Structure formats: structure tokens, C-alpha cells
Amino acid sequence: AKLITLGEILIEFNALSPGPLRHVSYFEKHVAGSEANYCVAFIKQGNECGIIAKVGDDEFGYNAIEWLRGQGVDVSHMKIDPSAPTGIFFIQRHYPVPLKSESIYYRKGSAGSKLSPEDVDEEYVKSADLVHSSGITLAISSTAKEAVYKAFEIASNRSFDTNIRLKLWSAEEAKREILKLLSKFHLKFLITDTDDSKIILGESDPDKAAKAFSDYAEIIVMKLGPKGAIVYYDGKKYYSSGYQVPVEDVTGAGDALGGTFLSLYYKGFEMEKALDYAIVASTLNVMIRGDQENLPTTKDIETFLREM
Amino acid sequence: AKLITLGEILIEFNALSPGPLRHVSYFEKHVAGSEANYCVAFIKQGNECGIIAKVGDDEFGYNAIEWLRGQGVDVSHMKIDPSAPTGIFFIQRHYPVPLKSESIYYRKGSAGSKLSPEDVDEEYVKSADLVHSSGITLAISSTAKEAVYKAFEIASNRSFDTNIRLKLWSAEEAKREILKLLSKFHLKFLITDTDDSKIILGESDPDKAAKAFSDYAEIIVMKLGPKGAIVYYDGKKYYSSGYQVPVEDVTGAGDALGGTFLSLYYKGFEMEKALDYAIVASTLNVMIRGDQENLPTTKDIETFLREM
Amino acid sequence: AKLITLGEILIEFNALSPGPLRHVSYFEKHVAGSEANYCVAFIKQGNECGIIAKVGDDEFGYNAIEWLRGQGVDVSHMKIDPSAPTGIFFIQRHYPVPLKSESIYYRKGSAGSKLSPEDVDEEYVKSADLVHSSGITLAISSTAKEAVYKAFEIASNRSFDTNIRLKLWSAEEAKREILKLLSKFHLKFLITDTDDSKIILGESDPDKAAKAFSDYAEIIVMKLGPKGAIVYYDGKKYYSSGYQVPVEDVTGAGDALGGTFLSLYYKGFEMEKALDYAIVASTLNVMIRGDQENLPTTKDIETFLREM
Amino acid sequence: AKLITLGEILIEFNALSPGPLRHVSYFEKHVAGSEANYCVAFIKQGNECGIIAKVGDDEFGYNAIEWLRGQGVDVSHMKIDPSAPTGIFFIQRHYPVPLKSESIYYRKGSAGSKLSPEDVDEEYVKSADLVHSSGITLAISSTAKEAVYKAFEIASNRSFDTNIRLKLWSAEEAKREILKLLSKFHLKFLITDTDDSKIILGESDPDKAAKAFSDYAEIIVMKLGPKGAIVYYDGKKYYSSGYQVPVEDVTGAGDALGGTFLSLYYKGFEMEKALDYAIVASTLNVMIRGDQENLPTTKDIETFLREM
Amino acid sequence: AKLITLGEILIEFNALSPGPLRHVSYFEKHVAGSEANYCVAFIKQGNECGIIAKVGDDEFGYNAIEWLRGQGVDVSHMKIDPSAPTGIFFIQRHYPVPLKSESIYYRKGSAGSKLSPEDVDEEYVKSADLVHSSGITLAISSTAKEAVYKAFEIASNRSFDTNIRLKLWSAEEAKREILKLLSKFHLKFLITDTDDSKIILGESDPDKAAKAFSDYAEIIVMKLGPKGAIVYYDGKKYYSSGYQVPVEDVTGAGDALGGTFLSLYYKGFEMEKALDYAIVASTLNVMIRGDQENLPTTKDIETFLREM
Amino acid sequence: AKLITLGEILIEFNALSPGPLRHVSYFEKHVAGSEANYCVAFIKQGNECGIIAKVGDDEFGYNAIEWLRGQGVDVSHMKIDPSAPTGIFFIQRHYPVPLKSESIYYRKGSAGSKLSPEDVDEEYVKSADLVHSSGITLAISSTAKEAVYKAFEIASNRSFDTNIRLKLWSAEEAKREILKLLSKFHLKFLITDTDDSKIILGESDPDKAAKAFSDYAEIIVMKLGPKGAIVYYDGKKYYSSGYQVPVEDVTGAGDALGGTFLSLYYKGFEMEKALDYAIVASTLNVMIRGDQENLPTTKDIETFLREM
Numbered sequence A, B, C, D, E, F: 001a002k003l004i005t006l007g008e009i010l011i012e013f014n015a016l017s018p019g020p021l022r023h024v025s026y027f028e029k030h031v032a033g034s035e036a037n038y039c040v041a042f043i044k045q046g047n048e049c050g051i052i053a054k055v056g057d058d059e060f061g062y063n064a065i066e067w068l069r070g071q072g073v074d075v076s077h078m079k080i081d082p083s084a085p086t087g088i089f090f091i092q093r094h095y096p097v098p099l100k101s102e103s104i105y106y107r108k109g110s111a112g113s114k115l116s117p118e119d120v121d122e123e124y125v126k127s128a129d130l131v132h133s134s135g136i137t138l139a140i141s142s143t144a145k146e147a148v149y150k151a152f153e154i155a156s157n158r159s160f161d162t163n164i165r166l167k168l169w170s171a172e173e174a175k176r177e178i179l180k181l182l183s184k185f186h187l188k189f190l191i192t193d194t195d196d197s198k199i200i201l202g203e204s205d206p207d208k209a210a211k212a213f214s215d216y217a218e219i220i221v222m223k224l225g226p227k228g229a230i231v232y233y234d235g236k237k238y239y240s241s242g243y244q245v246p247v248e249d250v251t252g253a254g255d256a257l258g259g260t261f262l263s264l265y266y267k268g269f270e271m272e273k274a275l276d277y278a279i280v281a282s283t284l285n286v287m288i289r290g291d292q293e294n295l296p297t298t299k300d301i302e303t304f305l306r307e308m
């Protein structure tokens, strides 16, 4: 199966030590961005994927290109923008809240925010089994929002990660635009959590949010944080619980789960063991700096499962 | 409110790996010293502070001056000793006792130890709301001890952290000299713990130690290690529990608590709320190498209290 | 004497290894920005300085403040911008050209670019012996350009580093705006080089460039890169050669020279000797990553001269 | 007392971050190999020891010699092979299984594997109080297996750590070769665990495995993983529980326990106390990268026990 | 144009500090091996290429695949070995000879040595414009040598880097196997040096070595180490001098020259200019640890030449 | 042949980046001190050596013991002082003077300074072929001075490195004390340089300084700094020139030369060859941090000489 994602790839600067950034002197570079992470989680389970994204005509842009190409992602439908730089962010870890991370963005007016419907080619989108994007892509600019509408219009099957970021838009704006997108397009997959349900449906309860969402989405993945996740489908509920592991950086974990779940679905996994495997990938993710560098293959997940 | 502390600022050489120093090859420099730590913690809560301290005419001494001045500490009452070197120490972490650190001093004949009553200006000391020192300052030299006596004679309100270091003086010396200071000068605040209570009073129980200490102090902070702290004030007793977090280096945690509690008292906090917030400060402290680098602002503490 | 400078403080991310950034994974943080660099170089010779700059209400903003305050720079006339982020930049070293570096900016719509006439206190500016800015400040925004005009309108004596950055503006607008400034305001000091001389006057010959510039500036420092610099004053020229040293990062060397040179002038140094000493400062600067970290005191320069 | 071990010394390259090696860029070097771990653990409790091993005529060879010599290990009966390299291995940490590690060997045809009967001096082996080897040594080559047979024939008292590596030989071969060894040579000490018992006897219950092994060994140490260990001696059994500590790398922990236990036995420690202390050594071991760097002295073990 | 190389891809472990490996504790991982380096230098000048190689079924094997795929090399003719490990090497730098490096191999019976004629597809080989191998491939095994003979029997145009490694065979066998190859297969390009000329022909002088080699090759590149390189073609000689730059690691530089030179020939560069450009690539190569990480594009080479 | 040195072993904290220590955050540990350095240099040329030194009962003390024992140094005549710390120092590199280093001591009242005649075993000293010390040991304390007097009284053949440290004693005391020692004890070897000659003799010219020193020493090694060294013996003079290498840290270089020269004299080397070889040892020394880690063997020197 082939996944096509639409969004902004970012270069990540991950603090080498925890604490406020004013006292961190070293930063470790990684390639990330939600849809880039989804792509890699998707191929790791043995499917194919491409990303529609625009990067700058700079080192960070070519870094993102080389990294994803090396991972086996189809990068041939990416664009290079000569008049705008690649977006970046910094990660401050475990401060002021232990176990949590904070993203600090330098993405405004980036090459990535300049993604437009003109970059969404019907001939390519038609080749996909699933077209995926996020609330991040909706939020970064109106051209990128337009690009999601275009791709979703073309798409037979649609996947959406809520991925709300209050640093990119108000909670009210986030509610309005997502409800707007869900109104226009019925989804095969909705990936969200209780934090975003609270913003969108004024509803923190996983069972209630999932019921309010069942009209827009066939299969709903409700992430609970460290506790794990619940999948809702065919009038069933299934809770897959998290694991206790050393937390280095949780950034990337929701995408690791999201991407792994979607890929196993297309490998014919039953819903519950797709989630069980997806939780393994997100568990491993929090253990490291880097959103992508220990996304597990199916065999690695199964090794974990034997011993854990 | 203005805090004035007297003590020895030290440069810290924190092992980059846990284990016996004989097999650690890399060390990370920080600026520390109990009274320097108290100042920054005090400042972080929106109050003002100065330190009366002597450093060497050397790179480490200017390091200490620049760092503190950068934190907004008043450094205009510091001295530079013409010939004695700035005091330093090394931290061996998690060995041979996990979750604990050991300080290895190179402070004998240091510029810090040459602090004397002649460095204590009377009108400066009158300008403070609270004057603070510790058992460390008493232990390093006769002149430093004298300096603390002079400051405490001039002070209207006095604070003292027992901070007993058996590497600097014997248990009897400590009991003697601390008891002598407390008999001479009633305290507004005593900051101590169980280990120092047993050495000074023979008494290990929090309540029994606190009752004895109330002959000398109005408000008693009885620290308990990872379990947290108890404040005793008036006829009340209040326990504030610690949090479970990954432990990097506990060095500094007691000052993080002490200094934060003190600052919040002068911001008008109830004793229990001031202790609660102070526990947050010392919790974040144990998570990092460096005694000062992740001292939180009041806002940071509240963020922690919400998302925790 | 007191220097006041106007410009944008930047946080620097300096590659830990040479080469194209797409293959560099580790980045080291420094506090930089031309006017910030001038400030520190000026105080290192024992004069006073302040900076009029705007930073963000973010970790990188308070980093800039703490660092500059620690260095003894007057920071009380800085502003904190509630909405825009602190400007940042990356350094790629020795690639594709050995011994050279290149700055990669993320400063568009930064807090620093939102410096305006409103941030320039008239009484504060009157307090300076020398008011200093550069071509970077002119180029970053209209309000920051406006701010320099205001400052220069009030100033008794003016200093200007041409500091042309062709990533910030075109050669023609650099030529036009610099000459517009020079014709409106006579300078006590002009700091430039043969590169910027080519752009502003078409003149690559340092003597002819100086002759052209002498209508606008009393004292002209014409830097020549590795080979040293020339001071033109009193109808005379003095050339001071550079030194051959291992080159880590040349970034900041120009500010090291200009700032040190200015400060020694006010210290009563004879003109040509003041340039000799400033060359030592720029020499030392190229030997490390960080624009400020090894700025020498007058005594350090003399140790260098004794031994070199 | 004197321990002589026979085995392959290995240079270890320890992944500086967790995750699959294809995305780890940094490796930290350590001297290891099971019998070298035993030697150092043994010397740390105040007895003497030597190793019979062969290393390459190469930097890694000389590294092992100098390190072991520095630790106080008799290295005079080691051999330098001119035609084969020192064997090495890489450690992949916490991936795919959290808290566990994986060794990736580059040891085939190594100098270590060329250990042979002729390298075993009768006189030297007779000077030992205890002659010790492992399943690793039987598995690496015939010559090394035959070397163990020769030394065990000459030895009065024998010690054996099963140390089964499925990467070195099959379960069936390991079962065959170990049972064959035990049938030929009565052991004073068998050091093993529940995994190796399952392979060798088809029995994973500690007590039943111990009873079955009692035909061949006089004192049986049954390691349980994180849970601790049980010692079987004189129809008696004694469980000594492990400690919960942050796990950096478990590699070496079983040798740290085994060597410390053996040495304290020869120091005249009561059996239960000898195991309590050996558990401290292995507890400390899992806390760092490096099999040998934080092996505790008896004194260090006692400090640990006072506090914990 | 399309290049096809045949040879062993190796994982490189690069000493982070100079000196004998026995006192170097940290190693930095890179992807290298001569033909792999040629491939990437070839792609950097805008041509296509692929590599015929086999890697182990291990992290280091998938690391090599991802890296090269990421760089744009065709990896579809690479194979995974069922049982043998990916070959690796360590680099000791600047000891005992300043500015020089030493490779220490763990490659015997590697996956890469098991490259064989049955892995070389005739139609793919025939599709290439140039087919290239080295003396390393000839040396590692007879299956690999067989594979080179096969590819060279099929190829219309051939290229060969002598790349003699005395750790892999004797001077005598190198002389014999290379002369045997040259007299069977006429080459379009011979890439070599004065060291290998001495071994193969007993002739160290470049002109006279080139004269003797002209019997087997149309275009001879005679590298000179730091001094640069001479190309001999069509009765002409052209010397292109090296540059003085700080040397971090010269490992990789000759491949960098070779691959860049070959690629620019197919871009229609005049021979002399191709060599000058090739020298820029090798010049930058020596400045970093990593054989591939700062291989320049043609554009980057032009930037170098413009300001140097 | 056996060298016995008497001195203070120090633990070295080497700055990981150049510049003023106030801005260096990372330090790298090495075992050092002049007589320790001589010992290892002596051993490296295949002779035997021991050291009489007192270290603390601390991690750094045991670090020193293990290191020197690992290098093959006889360590059995060292002492542990239970009441005083092992001495340490920091190295600040390339600031304020390029290519030079400075040592910042924390050695006052160290265990090494408590070296006393009591610690000099008469029997052991009589077993030496050469008993060596330096001006550092005369300067650290009066007991250590007396230790050198005792050992020199017992010895038949003596060696002395002037090694003047103006941070340890005044120019006049250094002159006075060294002339005292030279008058009391005829030296077989005097190792010095033109800086120390200027202080002791008022003479910085090599020939004139040697002429004056010839009344006191049989063989004089006059080090010149980077440009090399001269030997004076048997009415002969021989200058061996230095080499141009990249300089990391010159600390240790004079001891590398000293120790290597002495040891090669005892291998029966001509005086000129011994010096030549010694220069290579000191050339390599300046290229790394660490006084000891790249001391070459005779074979390493021969390789250097072959290529260089």
C-alpha cells in the first residue's frame, strides 16, 4: 500500500541537556516534522510512501531530502523553494515539566509554509491508497491549508492527525478549521488525543469524543499519553496500554504510533494488534532524541513483544 | 525584599559519567556554592539579593563574578584576593551510592576562606531584609566565621542553613560552633535536615529536633531528602512531599529549596504554599548537572504544578 | 568613556565540525551580534558601554540579556518584545572555502528587527561619548534604520561599521542607504573594509577608498582581512599587519578589532598603537568558535605582544 | 588467594546513545571480555589474579595489556599473536528491548581464539587457588576449548561460568559441550543462571536446576536477572535480591557478581554476605557503559550497604 | 553519464582524537570504502552511478544502504549476505606520522569479500559509460577479483584505481595481480600514484611511470600526495598543484580526486580543468573525519576556486 | 637500565577548547607531572623505571597509581598520605598567546608536597642507574627539596631538569636553590632551556649558558623551544632542529624530550641520534592534549623518521 503525506518537514535542534535553553550550549540535529515521521513509520512496516512538501534551497533543505530518500521515502514530488528557507525548531527537554518536551519554532514564512495547491498534482495523489495530513499543515499558512483541501478532494481515502499546536494558532481557530475540514471530508482514519478532543468537541472523555467523531471517521485512534491509546472501529473499543520506559524526549511518539498503525492496517493486521504494535513503536520513540532514528521494523517490534 | 548572603562561591567540576573519578575522563564546569545558589533561587522568585564573598584574581574568580552578575545578583560587595585561588570542587555521581553525589574539595587557603569581618560593610548589611549564611561559612576559617558573626550582629533578621560538611570539620566542631552561633543570635529562619539534627542535637526525629531548634528559630525548614520537607512555624507542622523524577545530580537541591522558600515568604506566600513551590525548585534541581542552571521562576513552578 | 550601540543581538549556532551543514550534527551556542560584540570588546579595555536592542520574551532573549549583563554591559535600555522571537543564526565553517565562515540567518520579523525610534531614549543617548551602529542595523528593517537616525541626530560623536550583508539587502540599496547616512551625519569613526568599499564607492584600493570616505569620517579603519588593517587619520595612513594563526572561525573578528580600537582611543592610546592592539584582539578571535569568548583585556594583549 | 582465568579478552565499542547502530554515530571504547571482568572484580576485593589469553600485536592488544596491568592483574602469562587481531565487539543498547543490550562480535579468527593448550603452563596453573573459565571460551574455537581442558586437568579447584552465547554456538552444542565438561571435571563453583539452566538441563526452576547441577559442582550461584541471585551450598540455599537502579548497560553485570563473589569467599566472608556484596557489584555495574570501570572495592560495597 | 563501481563498502570508525588507538576512547562512525567514495564524488558533479557490492544482514549493512541511497547512488544491484558481517575499519590519525592516517581492518571473510561473478549482471555492466574498480577489490578475495575480471570482460570502457594496500597483500602479489589485470584489460582511465608506481613498475618518477603505464591506459592520473596530481593524456602532461589546508584526516582524498575527475570528464570538462576541480574536492576532503561528508558539488568547487 | 625519579604526580585537567578558562566548560583528565612523564618516556625506549612520589588516599591518587602501573612504571615505592589530597592543575590553551599553554595549580599542601626524606628508601635509590629530579620538586615544599637532597646524596649518577615554575617560587629563589643543588651535586645530565638559563645564569645564549653549566654537569641538554634543542658533551655541540606540526598543547614536550634522550643514552645510542629521536618524541607530544598518551616507542620514532 502507498501512503502520501502533505506537510512541512522541519530540521530539529534537540538540546543535549535538559533545562531552560538559556543554559543549554549544545544541540543535536535531526530531521523531523509530523508527516516526515509518518512516512518513515509507514515504510518501516513494509509499505511505500511519499511526501508532498516544500523545502528551501539551503543545506537544511537538502539534508531533509537526503535523509528521507535514504529512508526509502519517495522525495520526487517535493519542491525546492529558492526564495525561502527550510523551517526549523528547537526542543527544550524536561523543563519546566519533567518527562515533557517543548518545541520552539523558527518556521514563519518558511519554504514549508509556501506549500500550495499548485504543488499537489492529481496524477500523483491518485497513486495513493491513503492520503494523510495534519492540523499542523492546516495551521502554517493558507496555501498549505488549500493544498490539504486539494489533496483530500482528489483522495479516495483520507487520514488526518489532529496535531493541534497552540503556538501556531488559537484553540478557537483550531476548533473551527478542523471541524470545517471534517465537515467537508469524511475520513478513513482520524488520529487524535484527549487534549485535542477537549479543544475541538469541548470533551476530554475518550469514549464521548470518539462517539462525536464517529460521524466523520471510520476508524478512530484516541491517544491517551503515556497511558497508551484506544482504537474505535465497527462499534468496538480497544485500549492498548503504554509501557514504563526511560524518557529522553517524547517528541515524535504520536507520529510513530500513527504511522505504524496505518502501515500495519494495510498489512492486514487485525485492529487490536495493529495498535499493540503501534504502541511499541511510540514506546521506543520516547527513549531517544530524534523523531525517526529508532522507528522499529515489524521484526524489531516482535522482538520487543517476546521479551516484554 | 533584599537577601544578603555570606559564604564561599565555588567552581564546580561535575563528572560527565557516574562512577569512581579514577575512571571518569570528562568534567563539566558550573558556578556553585551554597550562598551563591541561595541568591539565584531568591532572585528567581522576583526578589533582590547580594552576596558578600571573596574570590581569586584568576579565571575561576572572574567566572564566578560574571556568572552571578549575569543572574542579576549584586556583586559590588565582593572582593578579589590578591594571592589566594578561587575555591573549587569535583562531583562524583551515583557511586558508590546510586542517586547520591559526593563533593571533593580543593578549597584550603582559598580566596573564599579569606573572607573577613572587614569585608562586611555595616550600612550595606542594614539595607537587607534578611541576612543569610551556613555551617559551611563557619567551617572554612576563623575569619569567615567572624564575618558571619559581624553580619548577624548588624542584621535585624537572620537565616541559616546548617549545611554540615564532615569533610570540613568534625561532628563535634560542627555541633559546638553551630550551637554557639544560634545561642548568640535568634533566627527568623533555620534551614536544616535530619542528618544535621542528629549531629547538632543528637535527635533524629523531625518533630523532636524541631522542638529543640525552636529555642533558637521562628521558622524551621526540616528537609527529608527525596521524601520532601516539613516546615514548622508557630504551633503548626506541615509536610510537603517530594516528587519521583530521574536523578542526575542532587547537589544544589537543598539550596534550591531554601532560597526559593525564603524568596516566596517575602512575596507574601502562606508557609505551606512557599514550601510547596520550594519543593518544585529542588525537584527540578536533582534532574540536572549544575546547582543553578534550572532554578525555576515562579511562573515555571506553576506550570510544573499544573501539568503535574 | 561610554559607548552606546544600536543593533540586533543574535544567538549563534556554530557548527562543531567544518563542512556543509547537511552533514554537521552538532551545534554550539554563543551570544553574538555585531553591536553586542563591539560592546564587550569596548568594556574589555576598561571603558563603559550599553546596548539599545530589542529581544524576544523567550529563552534566547533572556540568554542574550544574562550574557551581556554578566559581561558588564549596561542592559537596562534593552526592550523585550512581547510577540516576535529572538533572531538567531547558524555558522558553517571552512566550506566551501577553507578559513572562511558563513552565517545562515533566521532573523526575519525578529524581535531585534522591531527596534524603532520609540526604543531610543534621548537622555540615555546624550550620556554617551560615542554612539555606534552598523549596516546590519540599517538593513534589518525600516524601524531599526529609523532608530539609528534618531540616535545619530542626538549624538555628540558617531561611529559606524559598514558591515554589509548582501543576504540582508542588495548592493545598490546598501550603497544608497550607507551614503544617505554618511551625508546626513559626519562620523568621528568609520569602520569598513575593501569589500564594502567596492560596494559603496566602487573602490577596491584602500587609499582611494579612504580618500573618498574622508569627507564623512574623521578617523577611518580600513580592514584588509587576514593581512591586517589600515588607520587613516590626520591626512596620514598607518598599516598594521595581521598574524598567522590557526583559524577556527573568523566570525566576529571585525567587531573585535573595531570595538577594541575604539576603546583604546578613549583610553588615551596613541592612534597607531591603538590599531596594533586591536589587531591582537581580532587575531585571537579567529582562533575560536564564539564572537566574544576570547576578547582580551589590555593586559592580555600585552602578554601576546611580549611573546609574539 | 589467586584466581587464574582462561578466555578471550575483547575490546568493547559501546554505543553512546540507545537505538539501532545504523543511526548511532558515536562509540565509547572499553576493555572487557568475561574472564578479564572476573579478574578485575576479583582483585578489587583484595586477592590476586592472572589471565591466560592471547591478544593481537596491535593497538587493541596493547590496550588490553596496559589496562589489565594497571588494574593489578598478572599479565605475564598472556601471549601476543603476530598474525591475528585482537577481537572486538560493539554494544547496541536498549533496542529493540528496553533495559537489555546486544553484543555484535568481530572476533572470528581473532588472536583470542588462538589460545591453545601450549599457552597453558603447568607450573603457573598449579600456583592458583582457583582456575576459572566459561562457555564463551569453549565456544570460540577448539584450541581454546582444549586449553580449558588442559587447565582443568591440572587444576585442583575449578570455577566455571556457563555464559552461554547463542551467537557463538547452538543451544544443542552448548548443552552438549558444557555437560561434557561438567562430567569430566568436578567444579568447586558453578556460576550460571535460569536461561542457561533451561538450555543445559531443560529446567528453568532455580532449585531443580541447582539440584541437578549439584552432581557436578560444590557451590552453585544461580543468577536471576534483575531479581538478584541464589547461592546453593551444603543442602542450603540463600536468595539475595537485586536493587532497582537506572540501567545504562547490563553488559558485564554477571561477571561483576561472579568475580566479586569468588574473591570474597577467599577473603573468608560468610557465604550469604559474600553474595550480598556481589549483588552490590553487579547492581553498580548495570549503571554505566563499561564492564569494568565501576567495579567496587569491598570498602565501596560497604558504603553502598550503609546507605542502602 | 553512468558509472558502475565494484568493491567493498566499509563502515569506518574514526578516532575522535589523534594518537595511538590504545589511548583513544571515542570513535566516530562514517560510511566509506573506495568505490562507495567514488560513487558519491561521481554523483556530486551531476552524473548517475551504481555500486556492485554485498553487505551483511546487520545494522552496519543497512546503514551503508541507507547512506548511499540517500546520496542518490543506485543500490539496487547490492546484495545482502546470508551469514557474513559487514566489513569495518578503524582510523588512527597523526600517529606516529603527523598529517597521515592508518586504517585498521576487520574485514576478513566479510560480506563484501563474498562479492562474486554471479553478482555482476552483464546487461547492467554493459549499460554503463564507465566501469571502475580498484586494487582493494582485487586483493580482498578471489571471488571479488573474479567479479572485477567479469565486469571488465563485459565493459567497453574501464577505470582502475591501483589503491595498493600492503595490509591486504604483499608488494609482490600486488605488482603481479595489477600487471596481470592491465595486460588483459586496456583502460580508459588509470588512477594511481608514485607509491604504487614504485611497487608495480619499480619506478617512482611520475613521468617515467606514466610512460610505462601508457601501454595499458589512455588517461593516467598520477597523484602526488599533498603536492597535487599530474594527468597524462594524448602526448600531453598537466600538473595541478595541491593547497595548504589544515589536515584532519587524509583518508578518502584520493577517491575524492578520482571520482570528481571522472565525473567532470563526462560533463565535458577539458582535462586540465577537470583535474583542477578534482584537486579542490580532495583538498576539502582532508579537512574532516569522513570520506564522503564534504565531497563538493561543481558549484561548491567553483566557489572555492573563485576565492582562493 | 633503571631510572628513578622523585617528584609530584599531578592530575591534569586539560581545557577542551582554547581561550580563557572563564569561558571553557569542558575539561579532559590526564595523568601528568614532570617526573611521571619522564618515567613513561624512559620505559617507552625499553628501559626500566620507578618513581618516588606521595599521592593522596583519594580517587585521583589511585588514578595516578593505576595509570603508571599500566604503563609499566614501578609504583611499589610510592606512598599514600591519608591526610592530604592528590595535587591537580588545569591547562588553559592558546590564550592569551597562540601555541602556548598555561598551568593553573591546585597543589598547595597536597600529598605530593609532603614527600619527605622519610619516603626515600636508601636501598631502592642505590639500585638506580640514574636518579632524576627537577626544580619543581625543589620548589613545592621544603620536605620535598630535602627528599631530593637525600636521594642525590645516595645516588652515584644524577639527572636534573631545571623546570622553573615562577608560579611556585621567585626568580631569585629558583636561581639560588638550583645553584645550591648544582654546587653540592655534580650532575651526569642537566636538562634545561634558554629561559631557565637566563634566570639561573643571567644568560640566554645556548653556548654561554652551557659553558657556565659545564662545571656542574657532564652532559647538557639545552632545549630551545619550537626550534629544537642542543646537546653539549665531550667538548662537542650538536643542534637537532624541531619540526613544524599542528599544536594542540605543548605541555609535556620537554619531559618527552628529556625522558626519551636519557633512555636512549642507556640503549647505547650515539649522542646525536639520541637527541634526534628525543626531538621526535617531543614533536608528537605537542600535537595532543595529554603529556603521556602519545609518547612514542623507539619503533614509532623510527617510522616517523622514515616518512619525515
Ligand SMILES: Nc1ncnc2c1ncn2[C@@H]1O[C@H](COP(=O)(O)OP(=O)(O)O)[C@@H](O)[C@H]1O
Binding pocket: A099, A192, A193, A223, A224, A225, A226, A227, A228, A229, A241, A242, A243, A244, A245, A247, A250, A253, A254, A255, A257, A279, A282, A283, A286
Ligand atoms: N512518558 C511516556 N512514557 C512511555 N510512553 C510514552 C510516554 N509518552 C508517550 N508515550 C507513548 O507514545 C504514545 C503517543 O504519545 P502521546 O503523547 O499520546 O502522543 P501525541 O502527543 O502525539 O498525542 C503513547 O500512546 C505512548 O505509547
Ligand SMILES: Nc1ncnc2c1ncn2[C@@H]1O[C@H](COP(=O)(O)OP(=O)(O)O)[C@@H](O)[C@H]1O
Binding pocket: B099, B192, B193, B223, B224, B225, B226, B227, B228, B229, B241, B242, B243, B244, B245, B247, B250, B253, B254, B255, B257, B279, B282, B283, B286
Ligand atoms: N533523590 C531525589 N529525588 C527527588 N527529589 C529529591 C531527591 N533528593 C532531593 N530531592 C529534592 O530536594 C529537596 C532537598 O533535598 P535534601 O537532600 O533534603 O537537601 P539537603 O541535602 O540540603 O538537606 C528534597 O526535599 C526534595 O524535594
Ligand SMILES: Nc1ncnc2c1ncn2[C@@H]1O[C@H](COP(=O)(O)OP(=O)(O)O)[C@@H](O)[C@H]1O
Binding pocket: C099, C192, C193, C223, C224, C225, C226, C227, C228, C229, C241, C242, C243, C244, C245, C247, C250, C253, C254, C255, C257, C279, C282, C283, C286
Ligand atoms: N584568516 C585570518 N587569519 C588571521 N587573522 C585574521 C583572519 N581573518 C581575520 N583576521 C583578523 O581579523 C581582522 C578583521 O578581519 P576582517 O575579515 O577584515 O573583518 P571584517 O570582515 O568585519 O572587515 C583582520 O584585520 C585580522 O587581524
Ligand SMILES: Nc1ncnc2c1ncn2[C@@H]1O[C@H](COP(=O)(O)OP(=O)(O)O)[C@@H](O)[C@H]1O
Binding pocket: D099, D192, D193, D223, D224, D225, D226, D227, D228, D229, D241, D242, D243, D244, D245, D247, D250, D253, D254, D255, D257, D279, D282, D283, D286
Ligand atoms: N536491569 C537490572 N537492574 C538492576 N540490576 C540488575 C539488572 N540486570 C542485572 N542486574 C544485576 O546484575 C546481576 C547479574 O545479572 P544477570 O542478568 O543475572 O547476569 P547473567 O546474564 O550473566 O546471568 C543481577 O543478579 C542483578 O543484581
Ligand SMILES: Nc1ncnc2c1ncn2[C@@H]1O[C@H](COP(=O)(O)OP(=O)(O)O)[C@@H](O)[C@H]1O
Binding pocket: E099, E192, E193, E223, E224, E225, E226, E227, E228, E229, E241, E242, E243, E244, E245, E247, E250, E253, E254, E255, E257, E279, E282, E283, E286
Ligand atoms: N596533507 C594534505 N594537504 C593538502 N592536500 C592533500 C593532503 N593529502 C592529500 N591531499 C589532496 O588529496 C589528493 C590525493 O592525495 P594522495 O595522498 O595522492 O591520495 P592517494 O594516496 O589515494 O593517491 C592530493 O593530490 C591532494 O590534493
Ligand SMILES: Nc1ncnc2c1ncn2[C@@H]1O[C@H](COP(=O)(O)OP(=O)(O)O)[C@@H](O)[C@H]1O
Binding pocket: F099, F192, F193, F223, F224, F225, F226, F227, F228, F229, F241, F242, F243, F244, F245, F247, F250, F253, F254, F255, F257, F279, F280, F282, F283, F286
Ligand atoms: N610549538 C612547537 N612546535 C613544534 N615543536 C615544539 C613546539 N614546542 C615544543 N616543541 C618540541 O618540544 C621540545 C621541547 O620544547 P621546549 O619548549 O624546549 O620544552 P621546555 O619548555 O620543557 O624546555 C622542543 O625542542 C621541540 O622539539
Ligand SMILES: O=C(O)[C@]1(O)O[C@H](COP(=O)(O)O)[C@@H](O)[C@H]1O
Binding pocket: C010, C032, C033, C034, C035, C089, C103, C136, C163, C165, C250, C251, C252, C253, C254, C255, C291
Ligand atoms: O548580522 C550579522 O551578520 C552579525 O551580527 O555580524 C557578526 C559578525 O560580524 P563580522 O562578520 O563583521 O565579524 C555576527 O554575530 C553576525 O551574525
Ligand SMILES: O=C(O)[C@]1(O)O[C@H](COP(=O)(O)O)[C@@H](O)[C@H]1O
Binding pocket: F010, F012, F032, F033, F034, F035, F037, F089, F103, F136, F163, F165, F250, F251, F252, F253, F254, F255, F256, F291
Ligand atoms: O608542575 C608542573 O608544572 C608540571 O609537573 O610540569 C609538567 C609539564 O612540564 P613541561 O611542559 O616542561 O613538560 C606538567 O605535567 C606540570 O603540571
Ligand SMILES: [Mg+2]
Binding pocket: A163, A254, A255
Ligand atoms: Mg501528535
Ligand SMILES: [Mg+2]
Binding pocket: B163, B254, B255
Ligand atoms: Mg544542603
Ligand SMILES: [Mg+2]
Binding pocket: C161, C163, C254, C255
Ligand atoms: Mg565586519
Ligand SMILES: [Mg+2]
Binding pocket: D163, D254, D255
Ligand atoms: Mg553472564
